[PDB]
Amino acid sequence: VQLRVFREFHLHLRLPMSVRRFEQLELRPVLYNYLDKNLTVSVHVSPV
Amino acid sequence: PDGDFNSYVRVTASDALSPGGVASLLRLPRGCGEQTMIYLAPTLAASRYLDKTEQWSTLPPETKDHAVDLIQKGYMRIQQFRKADGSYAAWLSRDSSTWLTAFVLKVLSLAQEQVGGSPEKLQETSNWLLSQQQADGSFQDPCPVLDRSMQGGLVGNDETVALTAFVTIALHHGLAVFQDEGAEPLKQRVEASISKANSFLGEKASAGLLGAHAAAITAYALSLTKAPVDLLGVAHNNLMAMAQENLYWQAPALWIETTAYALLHLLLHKAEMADQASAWLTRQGSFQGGFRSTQDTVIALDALSAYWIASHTTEERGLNVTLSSTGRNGFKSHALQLNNRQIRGLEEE
Amino acid sequence: KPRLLLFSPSVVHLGVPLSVGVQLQDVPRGQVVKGSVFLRNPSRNNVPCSPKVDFTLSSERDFALLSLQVPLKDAKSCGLHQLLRGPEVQLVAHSPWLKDSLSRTTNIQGINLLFSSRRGHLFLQTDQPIYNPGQRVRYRVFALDQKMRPSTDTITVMVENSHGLRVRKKEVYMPSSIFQDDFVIPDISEPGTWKISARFSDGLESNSSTQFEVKKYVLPNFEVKITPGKPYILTVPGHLDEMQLDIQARYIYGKPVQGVAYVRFGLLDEDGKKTFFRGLESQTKLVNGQSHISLSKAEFQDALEKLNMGITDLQGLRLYVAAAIIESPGGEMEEAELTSWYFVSSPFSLDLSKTKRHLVPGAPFLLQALVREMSGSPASGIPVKVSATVSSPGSVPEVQDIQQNTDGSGQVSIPIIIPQTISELQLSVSAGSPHPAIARLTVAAPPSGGPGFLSIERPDSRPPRVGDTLNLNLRAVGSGATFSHYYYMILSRGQIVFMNREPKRTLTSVSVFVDHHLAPSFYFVAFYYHGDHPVANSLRVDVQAGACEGKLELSVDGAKQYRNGESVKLHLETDSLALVALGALDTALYAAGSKSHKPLNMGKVFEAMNSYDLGCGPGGGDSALQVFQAAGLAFSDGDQWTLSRKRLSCP
Ligand SMILES: *[C@@H]1O[C@H](CO)[C@@H](O)[C@H](O)[C@H]1NC(C)=O
Ligand SMILES: *[C@@H]1O[C@H](CO)[C@@H](O)[C@H](O)[C@H]1NC(C)=O
């Protein structure tokens, strides 16, 4: 039984398998906007 | 220093006679006390050869029961020719013969696995055989067999030594069917008699100048009956010194009989040497209507069955490995074993 | 003249009952026979290691189907496992009537069977198809017997490494016919394919296996699929067709993908050597998630000439196309490859495996063919032309031409007529036009002077479903009408199932109810006695694959769309109390996996059930013994018998 899930507006984040410590990397989360209305959002990463 | 340590061990292990010809020997015994043996001996030899070689799958199951009933009738055939002391002469009125009693004893002993006959009757036959022993362990035949061409290689330069060896062979064959309890003096005297006979055979073999067939049967009798080290060694050395050359020795029945006896003796003792003898024997037996005399049939069939059962047997080919080491985690030793493990060359990690 | 028949499967599986059918032929009405039947080892001694089963026969009841157990304990007792060469056991039917009536040499009649050790079915399942190194693996194994019911026997699972080394072994005592277990892949495991096996403890050769690939991966976001316009390319010297492809990119949740597709072309040989064209590459955007590309004939020929090659060399080579699309503006890239675009000289195919061989003379010969597209679904409406030459029966050979269009699933049944006294038949089949697919078949007629022939006609040439009756028309051709009954039997999954007796009329019709214990195929063997000789014929019927014995419908009523965290109502329904083994799997795993790894569906179950069969070929034989041997029987009446199987697999 195929059972698909959807959000119509979501964040997709794909981290690598592993990263050496002290080595700079770049995160590229992508916003998907499948709604019918042009939007505007603010994106930030929670410090830790 | 703050790394992760892992260890892995992996142990990779890297690894006959045609049924129709032998089947034709099944013939219903008929005739006098000698003709019944004439018919039965190749028949029982053929039954045993097929039975041990597992060639029944090439014949209908009705053949097996027919052979069983035939052998039962043949065994019952000589029960009316038995004398008072189990002499088993050619006739009730005629006198007995040592070779005839030996042959009857051997056949009855070899045919006791299918039908249960009273061993107490076989005790009297063994007793009669013992009663004719001489001072040095030899035996004398009161009357020669009526048919001389069926006796095989017994006739020749020497006859007494071969007759004694054959009688000892028959006694050893009948020794297995002896009851595990009762008649203790009987078995003790049988052991003493056979030991004396092996001593005599070893002395004669050391003396040498014996016939080829006689030397072969004496060597086989010594090897089978647990001869002493010196006598067995000298007999074996005498036998191998007369080996000829895959061709070994339409061949005469004497050649077939001596080759079969040598093959059986050597198998009792198999590396690049029995193969040529077995191949020559099989080629000789491939002749249409081959194995003329009864003795050659019996001995060749027994030798070929023994060779087949010895050659086709396999080996376990097991393996065991144990690792022991000392570390901060106390002490621990670890054992792993591969084997056939239902998979040729099992590999473990 | 009186005879006692004896039928049994060719191969015995130890620990599973044997279906032995006995029959009495040409017996006076006043004779009633009674006896016993048992197995027997010929070598060790006549020690029957099987419970003797009695049978009573008479004129009114001249046949009886007995079930003969072969327990493991007795079979081990007789030394059947101590045999050196040849796993062969004998079956014997002993009755005092034989000696009393026929005055036979001995009252033992039987066959030389060939035992085996397979028994029951085992099915293995894993958590997911492809695993990351250092990730837990959960597997469960179900155990069933040959009757397809749950079993409580004891199995011994074992895992294997990619190199082939054993890694873990266990033994279980199932009370519920399911065994679940977990194990961890070592973190440093190299990429490869691991295998999990499971066999019955007693049965050495009753193993069953599953595979799962181990590979370092990150689960993808979208899947790329390349679809050729046609699954073949015509390299016939007359013309070369167009080469066109459609590449589609689709997110896992359904929405299309916006991005740029970069495609490269090349040649690829069956060995595995790829030769790319330094050129001919395509870089096109994706509209609605699909991009249409094609290779023109002129540019393809130019590329071929630049490679120092001609179009004649494209015999076994295939065009290999690789694509690596880049999503925009996400930036993620995914790759796809095609390795199934063969170069062919004919756009169709022919499968004459359904056609019988050495069929009887005097009755129509049905040629059955399955026209199928080159790497595709079976065709329909494609004309098939058959040229059948009936070779010299005493005069010059005569040819016939018959044309018929395939109906559905490619099946075509062309009834070429054959006269009596035929010598041989030569068949030239051509499917489609232009560029036809040509096949040939030669059939040799049976030797003359036979006691007759039996013709089994099937009015309907379509696979019966389950629960539908099947009608076959028996007829006797070229024989004397001295008998009174036709004797027929059914053989499904290697065991005799049915055995009956139909009276003889003009065009006798037999009806067999296709039950649930006959799937997925069965053999219909019928025969009759023309004096003192058997005349037999056989036939194979493939029951159409459909529903189960029971049922299980997992249905979620509503739309496919959902939202994360939602509650979903899952309904399960059966016909009795059952242990439903559930599992929900992501779909991006299939995209991640390099190679397809199909799950356990009804096809695998059907293959498992019929893998125990002993039948071989589509049926038919030159004599009765050949027919029975092809079917998988062991016949012995007293004058004829079938030689033992040489190996488990048919030639
Ligand atoms: C959203 O953006 C587009 C340009 O990307 C602009 O033309 C449009 O007016 C905006 N609003 C919509 C689509 O409702
Ligand atoms: C069972 O094991 C044998 C080797 O013993 C193997 O060849 C065979 O393919 C296995 N059967 C399966 C996996 O169904």
Curated annotation (Swiss-Prot), chain A:
Glycosylation-annotated residues: N38
PTM note: Upon activation, the internal thioester bond reacts with carbohydrate antigens on the target surface to form amide or ester bonds, leading to covalent association with the surface of pathogens.
Compartmental location: Secreted; Cell surface
Activity: how regulated: Specifically inhibited by nanobody hC4Nb8, inhibiting the classical complement pathway. Specifically inhibited by NbB5, NbE11 and NbH9 nanobodies, and to a lesser extent by NbH11 and NbE3 nanobodies.
Complex and partners: Complement C4b is composed of complement C4b-A, complement C4 beta and complement C4 gamma chains that are associated via disulfide bonds. Non-enzymatic component of the C3 convertase, also named C4bC2b, composed of the serine protease complement C2b (C2), as well as complement C4b. Non-enzymatic component of the C5 convertase, also named C4bC2bC3b, composed of the serine protease complement C2b (C2), complement C3b, as well as complement C4b.
Job of this protein: Non-enzymatic component of C3 and C5 convertases. Generated following cleavage by complement proteases (C1S, MASP2 or GZMK, depending on the complement pathway), it covalently attaches to the surface of pathogens, where it acts as an opsonin that marks the surface of antigens for removal. It then recruits the serine protease complement C2b to form the C3 and C5 convertases, which cleave and activate C3 and C5, respectively, the next components of the complement pathways.
Protein name per UniProt: Complement C4b-A
Organism: Homo sapiens (Human)
Gene designation: C4A
